[PDB]
Amino acid sequence: GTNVNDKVTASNFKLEKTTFDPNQSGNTFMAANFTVTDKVKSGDYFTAKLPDSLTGNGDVDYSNSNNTMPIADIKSTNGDVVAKATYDILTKTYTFVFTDYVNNKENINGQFSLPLFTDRAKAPKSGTYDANINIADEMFNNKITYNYSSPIAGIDKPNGANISSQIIGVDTASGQNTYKQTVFVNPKQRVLGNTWVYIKGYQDKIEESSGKVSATDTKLRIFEVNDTSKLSESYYADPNDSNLKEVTDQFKNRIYYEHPNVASIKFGDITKTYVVLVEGHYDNTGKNLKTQVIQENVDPVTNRDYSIFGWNNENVV
């Protein structure tokens, strides 16, 4: 079929919300009517192209589904399906392919409503971004403000436990049940002794989470951070970033699976911030994926002043 953006016009475009916190499940929606201004055929299509600051999938990962996100059928004003839809993750583009519906009609009107999320990689810091959206080769301009809850959290003491994490990818479609999670260890970059980090696949009750953390279910990569001021607030973290120095190999014997659904990591005496990239799995119970990361340590000088800090995450499976 042929690209018919030049025959499709979108109108009364709306963004539901233009300020939100993607670290507390903030998101938005775009809505629009569209009308087909000329004869189009079944299999012809128009597109919507998202800007740097947005994604159509958010924290749902489609890398195990050909990197393509299924989208609910587009309806005509009369309630029937006018087009099949998919969202391409790489090009951040929705493709709406007209069905046989259009073969017998003129004056075709429809409408769509689509959730929108931050792009944690391209909008890694809190602030205001352009969010200009291209529908059927027309711009609909917007500004978006992300107030990311800060990943920099912990006990308010110069020697206190401090750590946070965020689940930034859950594969809900393929059946493989994978997830991606970024953990910042010591984001305050304090001087800490006998530091231990625990990555749990549950929070308080093990049977209330689909999380599955074990030596066969979980892979960890650990990075020493060079310049902490370049770390994201979105929790996005590129393992090939030169501001990170991988030290996974040096941890081959500092990682233990001593308890059910928990990875224990022996950081020891540290003076740096670390990034722990987690690749996990969750089970088939239908339960929410709840996680909890815990850091405990002492004062590196006196070995006293013990502190512990914990951080919860939760995404639906």
Partner: peptide, 12 residues
């Protein structure tokens, strides 16, 4: 053991 952070995405 208990401050918090949450994500959001779409299932299409």
């Amino acid at each position: 053991w208990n401050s918090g952070s949450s994500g959001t995405g779409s299932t299409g």
